[PDB]
Amino acid sequence: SSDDISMEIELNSTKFETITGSDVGLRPPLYPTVSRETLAFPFGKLSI
């Protein structure tokens, strides 16, 4: 699940697409496969 999630802020005319492959080397695994376990994807101080 490298580069799987990605924030893309739209400005008034432009946009800037970042991605967690460009941010986070910490990678929440789908194992704990046992049901209803939710995950997290922190973006540290996204200076737009």
């Binding site: 970042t18 492959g21 460009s22 941010d23 080397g25 973006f43 101080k45 996204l46 200076s47």
Partner: protein
Amino acid sequence: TDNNPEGWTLDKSVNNGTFAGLAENGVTGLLQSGEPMDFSGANALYFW
């Protein structure tokens, strides 16, 4: 090209940007100026 600290052009110019041992289209890892806290640095013993 700018004095923005985080920007360091993503897979930069004319050279292909491949060592022959990375084997990805992804190199970048550029962003997130704030690294996590270090438990192997100078202040390691106090944190531990």
